[PDB]
């Protein structure tokens, strides 16, 4: 029984007697181990003895000693030494810890050797003592019908054999089981797998299971194509639509891919798809024609500007230079965005004449936000100010070429050849200041039209503008080249534009180059660290400004603790208020995924002696919390509203305007205090100048698009980071430093509508749902789950957040599929009985085509 | 499922370490409001 | 399955606040230098 004398008798002869001696020891291994541990070195010495054949049973004894000694690493070695006595299926606290310890050490070596070889799990690169328990644990979880621990550990183990082989045996094909399995693999691996190559294969292997399209989830396969940006998988989706013929399923795939894909993937869906055959109904869909048509028509049906509250805002004073006129013009241009209403410019004469020279840019560019989405008459709005028709002056003429950039952005291939010809004419030299103004709006318009597509002609045309060292259009040339270099970009253009920033020192140039060097690196993560190190080591104020946005864009989406430590040390050690403001704003772009921890960090930075630090955290809080929940961020911005600093209250009103969209009517109790401050701060002369100027746009953002459009960034509809939405918010960070850039914000405003259309072509009918919904669209600025139906759930405005409780009635000619898919841009639900009257109403969308 | 629970217990232990930040932040705000 | 996802999400707060309390001490040292100038 007592193992103390037996362990000392193992140095004698007759090894057959030692077999019987070890039998009585296995009882006290969990009892006397604190005593017999003095004889433990004799147990380990016999394992290496070639004449000792009892190591099979001797390994079990030593496995329970070192473990209870407090060494978890040793318990794995002695347990797998024999590879026989160890039983993983036995349920005890001794085995479960050894299994969890072997997996923990296996993840550390899996994240390293994966770079050299991806086949390491099939090879000897890893010592089998790590993979022995790791393989037996997965097989034990598969027999227990538990996919939480099996799939969760597989993502940490970085092994492709587990997910690929086990999924084939677990196939239940309802057919909704395989959809949730990938959803558990997609959601967890993003915050777990640190290597973009491993998660690239997980989405690729899952494509071969659903490739047959047995009424499976297309949104799951769409997120695979968008994340991988593969041209072969995008074309393969339409290859299966030719075999299985469905008008409803093939449509929803086409509307979804055109919005989330970049300019490079749209060429495969149009040019490459035409060569291999296509659907005549789906060709125009992938070209973006219906996408812009839905945004313009849905806003025109229900439109409330409420000019009564706006008249009192813009009639206060004619002075304060353009800062008052710019505030009311940029704000009003948001309310009519997409509805094509010129009443501010046309119906009101005096507010246009009171503007200054450079102030006429906002009055002209306001129509670009208003008429955004018009691919036909968008040029006729700027027709009198186009080149060759001259203009009232050359300061206002430059805004016309920029107005075409906001409307046609991404569709501006026709204007791409038109806008670059004006740059070549002015590329020689400039004799006047307003000449660069015409080049300023031209370079920004072609940058938006070519945004997302790499063009060597636009890069070389704007490169000659940088050589001229223009104090006005110098930033426009840098921003135009950065939008073409979005994504991986050109590595040669990284060091070239960085060299011109050190050679040419200018405020409007280098600052634009610093932002341009941030746009060229998008989603590169550690690949952009070479440029980040050069900016952090330099003491230049403008180079440190672009260093934060370079970290913001590359490290966005999935959060990274390495990018947090960089932005935190810069906002503290550096004494520059503009750089501290850029570091706290750059933190919000990395936190876009998790909006719950964003206010907690802002509360820590809400108390500071610097105004720019509190001003940066104000707008950075509203970036991630715009279209998300957690209404408590309003109370965080309350003390910033009382800040005597002028520009802090300006960014505070804008941040409040982003979170409070559609929060009225007994949703957020703070909507009463924000609506009073609209007319109170403007009319009162005791407040700050920039405070009332920001309250104008603050009232204009909540009323933008006629109370309809909302700011959607990193949602379930897109599936990834929106390129147009993240760039527009960066431009807002520069307001009074040079000239308001707020016109770029129009890319983030999208309406909220739910409509089925048809299964073939454009319809926009009129029907009713009557499902549980909050009261929003019928609550406009004036002069508990009860399962109770709402007035009309079709179209209107409402809210995307609380619309998850809205169902779809099946009593009409349509049928529900996703049970409120909840996608406002894609829409186009399934029609089970086409060619039947829907009570269709033809919209004005023909004018936008 | 015990591997996740035992690991989560460390977060609750480090939660009391976050309490040390409130003592330093309030002492820092007293110096900020003073200057 | 939320216990696995929310597990690694809480370390982001422990990562920032670990070096953030150290920045308050560096700021406190700067306030002491400003306090000597006030005298």
Curated annotation (Swiss-Prot), chain A:
Cellular component annotations (GO), alphabetically ordered: nucleus; proteasome complex; proteasome regulatory particle, base subcomplex; proteasome storage granule
Pfam families linked: HEAT_2, PC_rep, RPN2_C, RPN2_N
Domain of life: Eukaryota
UniProt keywords, alphabetically: Acetylation, Phosphoprotein, Proteasome, Repeat
GO biological process: proteasome assembly; proteasome-mediated ubiquitin-dependent protein catabolic process; regulation of protein catabolic process; ubiquitin-dependent protein catabolic process
Protein modification: N-acetylated by NAT1.
The UniProt record lists the keyword Acetylation: yes
UniProt cross-references to InterPro entries, sorted A to Z: 26S_Psome_Rpn2, ARM-like, ARM-type_fold, Proteasome/cyclosome_rpt, PSMD1_RPN2_N, RPN2_C
PC repeats mapped onto the chain: 362-395, 399-436, 441-475, 476-510, 512-545, 546-581, 582-614, 616-650, 651-688, 694-730
A molecular-function term among this protein's GO annotations: ubiquitin protein ligase binding
Assembly and oligomerization: Interacts with UBR1.
Other facts: Present with 4750 molecules/cell in log phase SD medium.
Membership in a protein family: Belongs to the proteasome subunit S1 family.
Functional summary from the UniProt entry: Acts as a regulatory subunit of the 26S proteasome which is involved in the ATP-dependent degradation of ubiquitinated proteins.
Name of the protein in its database record: 26S proteasome regulatory subunit RPN2
From Swiss-Prot, chain B:
Role: The 26S proteasome is involved in the ATP-dependent degradation of ubiquitinated proteins. The regulatory (or ATPase) complex confers ATP dependency and substrate specificity to the 26S complex.
Note: Present with 4700 molecules/cell in log phase SD medium.
Name of the protein described by the UniProt record: 26S proteasome regulatory subunit 8 homolog
Family: Belongs to the AAA ATPase family.
PTM comment: N-acetylated by NAT1.
Subcellular location: Cytoplasm; Nucleus
Subunit architecture: May form a homodimer or a heterodimer with a related family member. Interacts with OLA1, TMA17, and UBR1.
Highest taxon in the source lineage: Eukaryota
UniProtKB/Swiss-Prot annotation, chain C:
Gene: RPT3
Biological role stated in the UniProt entry: The 26S proteasome is involved in the ATP-dependent degradation of ubiquitinated proteins. The regulatory (or ATPase) complex confers ATP dependency and substrate specificity to the 26S complex.
Native species: Saccharomyces cerevisiae (strain ATCC 204508 / S288c) (Baker's yeast)
Reported modifications of this chain: N-acetylated by NAT3.
Location(s) in or outside the cell: Cytoplasm; Nucleus
Residue window of the full protein shown: 48 to 86 of 428
Top-level taxon of origin: Eukaryota
Protein name: 26S proteasome regulatory subunit 6B homolog
Family of the protein in this entry: Belongs to the AAA ATPase family.
């Amino acid at each position: 029984t007592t193992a103390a004398p037996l362990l000392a008798l193992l140095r004698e002869n007759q090894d057959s007697v030692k077999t019987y001696a070890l039998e009585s020891i296995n009882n006290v291994v969990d009892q006397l181990w604190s005593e017999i541990s003095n004889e433990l070195p004799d147990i380990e010495a016999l394992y290496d003895d070639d004449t000792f054949s009892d190591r099979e049973m001797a390994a079990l004894i030593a496995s329970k000693v070192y473990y209870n000694l407090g060494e978890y690493e040793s318990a794995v070695k002695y347990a797998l030494a024999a590879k026989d006595r160890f039983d993983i299926d036995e349920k005890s606290q001794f085995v479960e810890t050894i299994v969890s310890k072997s997996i923990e050490m296996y993840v550390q070596e899996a994240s390293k050797q994966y770079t050299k070889d991806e086949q390491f799990y099939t090879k000897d690169i890893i010592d089998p003592k790590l993979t022995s328990i790791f393989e037996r644990m997965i097989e034990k979880c598969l027999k227990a019908s538990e996919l939480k621990l099996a799939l969760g550990i597989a993502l940490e183990g970085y092994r492709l054999d587990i997910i690929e082989s086990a999924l084939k045996s677990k196939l239940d094909q309802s057919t909704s089981e395989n959809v949730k399995i990938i959803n558990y693999l997609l959601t967890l691996a993003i915050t777990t797998v640190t290597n973009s190559k491993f998660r690239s294969s997980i989405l690729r292997k899952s494509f071969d299971f659903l490739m047959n399209m047995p009424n499976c989830d297309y949104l799951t396969l769409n997120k695979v194509v968008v994340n991988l940006n593969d041209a072969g998988l995008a074309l393969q989706l339409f290859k299966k639509l030719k075999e299985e013929n469905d008008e409803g399923l093939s449509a929803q795939i086409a509307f979804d891919l055109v919005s989330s894909a970049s300019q490079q993937l749209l060429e495969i869906l149009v040019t490459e798809l035409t060569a291999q055959g296509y659907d005549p109904a789906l060709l125009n869909i992938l070209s973006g024609l219906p996408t812009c048509d839905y945004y313009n028509t849905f806003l025109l049906n229900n439109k409330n500007i409420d000019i009564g509250l706006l008249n009192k805002s813009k009639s206060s004073l004619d002075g304060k230079f353009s800062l008052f006129h710019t505030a009311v013009s940029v704000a009003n241009g948001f309310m009519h965005a997409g509805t094509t209403d010129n009443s501010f410019i046309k119906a009101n004469l005096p507010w246009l004449g009171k503007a200054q020279n450079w102030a006429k840019f906002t009055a002209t560019a306001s129509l670009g936000v208003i008429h955004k989405g018009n691919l036909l008459e968008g040029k006729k709005v700027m027709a009198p100010y186009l080149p060759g028709s001259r203009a009232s002056s050359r300061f206002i003429k430059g805004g016309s070429l920029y107005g075409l950039g906001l409307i046609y952005a991404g569709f501006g291939r026709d204007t791409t050849d038109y806008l670059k010809n004006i740059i070549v004419e002015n590329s020689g030299t400039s004799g006047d200041e307003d000449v660069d103004v015409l080049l300023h709006g031209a370079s920004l318009g072609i940058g938006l039209a070519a945004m997302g597509s790499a063009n060597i002609e636009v890069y070389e045309a704007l490169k000659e503008v940088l050589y001229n060292d223009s104090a006005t259009s110098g930033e426009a040339a840098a921003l135009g080249m950065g939008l073409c270099m979005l994504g991986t970009g050109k590595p040669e253009a990284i060091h070239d534009m960085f060299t011109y920033s050190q050679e040419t020192q200018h405020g409007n140039i280098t600052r634009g180059l610093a932002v341009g060097l941030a746009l060229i690196n998008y989603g590169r993560q550690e690949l952009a660290d070479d440029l980040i190190t050069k900016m952090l080591a330099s003491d230049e104020s403008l180079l440190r400004y672009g260093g934060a946005f370079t970290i913001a864009l590359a490290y966005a989406g999935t959060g990274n603790n390495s990018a947090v430590k960089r932005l935190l040390h810069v906002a503290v050690s550096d004494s520059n208020d503009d750089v501290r403001r850029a570091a706290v704003i750059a933190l919000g772009f990395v936190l876009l995924r998790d909006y719950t921890t964003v206010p907690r960090i802002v509360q820590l930075l809400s108390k500071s002696h610097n105004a720019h630090v509190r001003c940066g955290t104000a707008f950075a809080l509203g970036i991630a919390c715009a279209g998300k929940g957690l209404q408590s961020a309003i109370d965080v911005l309350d003390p910033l509203t009382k800040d005597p600093v002028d520009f802090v209250r300006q960014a505070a009103m804008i941040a409040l305007s982003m979170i409070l969209i559609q929060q009225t009517e007994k949703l957020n109790p703070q909507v009463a205090d924000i609506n009073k401050n609209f007319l109170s701060v403007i009319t009162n002369k005791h407040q700050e100048g920039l405070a009332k100027f920001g309250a104008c746009v603050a009232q204009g953002i909540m009323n933008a698009g006629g109370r309809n459009v909302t700011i959607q960034l990193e949602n379930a509809d897109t599936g990834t980071l929106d390129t147009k939405s993240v760039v527009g918010l960066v431009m807002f960070s520069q307001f009074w430093y040079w000239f308001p850039l707020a016109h770029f914000l129009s890319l983030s405003f999208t309406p909220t509508t739910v409509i089925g259309i048809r299964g073939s072509d454009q319809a926009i009918p009129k029907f009713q749902m009557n499902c549980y919904a909050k009261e929003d669209a019928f609550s406009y600025p004036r002069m508990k789950y009860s399962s109770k139906p709402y007035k009309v759930d079709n179209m209107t405005r409402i809210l995307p957040q609380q619309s998850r409780y809205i169902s779809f009635i099946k009593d009409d000619r349509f049928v529900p599929v996703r049970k409120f898919k909840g996608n406002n841009g894609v829409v186009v639900l399934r029609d089970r009985e086409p060619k039947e009257p829907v009570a269709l109403i033809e919209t004005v969308r023909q004018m936008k085509d | 499922e015990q591997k996740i629970q035992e690991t989560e217990l460390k977060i609750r232990s480090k939660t009391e370490n976050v309490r040390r930040l409130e003592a330093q932040r309030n002492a820092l705000n007293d110096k900020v409001r003073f200057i | 399955y939320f216990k696995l996802k929310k597990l690694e999400k809480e370390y982001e707060l422990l990562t920032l606040q670990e070096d953030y309390i150290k920045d308050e001490q560096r700021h406190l040292k700067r306030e002491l230098k400003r306090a000597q100038e006030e005298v």
